[PDB]
Amino acid sequence: MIIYRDLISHDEMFSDIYKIREIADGLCLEVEGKMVSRTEGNIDDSLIGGNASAEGPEGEGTESTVITGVDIVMNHHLQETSFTKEAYKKYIKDYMKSIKGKLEEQRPERVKPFMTGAAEQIKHILANFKNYQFFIGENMNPDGMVALLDYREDGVTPYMIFFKDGLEMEKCLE
């Protein structure tokens, strides 16, 4: 299988184990994950919860331990950060420049589309900043790129927006 790591930090933000869809004409890629809930397994201990009983045979403390979230975010150790509208403007220029410059040394012929696509896609998300959230690998590199986690039309299937120009691939089976 092939992995997907940022071009700045080289951190595998995701892999080809999910449904990746190239958007913006190959500019960005949408990684389709899946929300995994947790609340099964007849087994409770002090580690998770459980109260300290002593008197009375009939007594329940109720642990209430449920875990839910995006799979890729749990396995990729994704981290959600914060950002403002104005800050994002300078953020895009700073992050897009990091990829643009690096791309200029690798595929300078692709720096042009990225310049237009970057400003285009960004303006799109900005219009829905309240819907899109900033996510980063387990490193949370501020100088790197950002992962926009959104939900499909159904609002269930969680997908993240990744930048192709600012992301590299690597085939590693073993």
Q: In what order do the strands lie in the sheet with 147-151?
A: 19-23, 28-32, 158-163, 147-151, 133-136, 79-81
Instruction: With respect to residue 174, please indicate whether it lies within any of the assigned structural domains.
Output: no
Instruction: With respect to residue 36, please indicate whether it lies within any of the assigned structural domains.
Output: yes
Closest-CA residue to 135 (of 83, 67, 92):
83
What would the two tokens of residue 116 be? Answer: 């237009």
Give the dihedral of Cα atoms 171, 157, 29, 137; nearest 10 deg.
-60
| Chain Cα centroid distance, residue 4 | 12
Distance CA 143, CA 8 (A): 7
Q: What is the largest CA-CA distance in the chain?
A: 76
Instruction: With respect to residue 62, please indicate whether it lies within any of the assigned structural domains.
Output: yes
Closest-CA residue to 137 (of 70, 69, 68, 73):
73
Count of domains forming the chain: 1
DSSP code per residue over the chain: -EEEEETTT--EEEETTSEEEEETTTTEEEEE--EE-----S---TTT------S-SS----------EEHHHHHTT-EEE---HHHHHHHHHHHHHHHHHHHHHH-GGGHHHHHHHHHHHHHHHHTTTTT-EEEE-SS--TTS--EEEEE-TTS-SEEEEEESTTEEEEE---
Closest-CA residue to 146 (of 17, 18, 28, 22):
28
Instruction: With respect to residue 54, please indicate whether it lies within any of the assigned structural domains.
Output: yes
What would the two tokens of residue 134 be? Answer: 């900033």
Instruction: With respect to residue 121, please indicate whether it lies within any of the assigned structural domains.
Output: yes
Instruction: With respect to residue 110, please indicate whether it lies within any of the assigned structural domains.
Output: yes
Distance CA 150, CA 128 (A): 10
What would the two tokens of residue 40 be? Answer: 């099964």
- Residue range(s) defining the domain that contains residue 90: 1-169
Distance CA 149, CA 136 (A): 10
Instruction: With respect to residue 102, please indicate whether it lies within any of the assigned structural domains.
Output: yes
Instruction: With respect to residue 111, please indicate whether it lies within any of the assigned structural domains.
Output: yes
Look up the CATH number of the domain holding residue 34: 2.170.150.10
What would the two tokens of residue 25 be? Answer: 């004409």
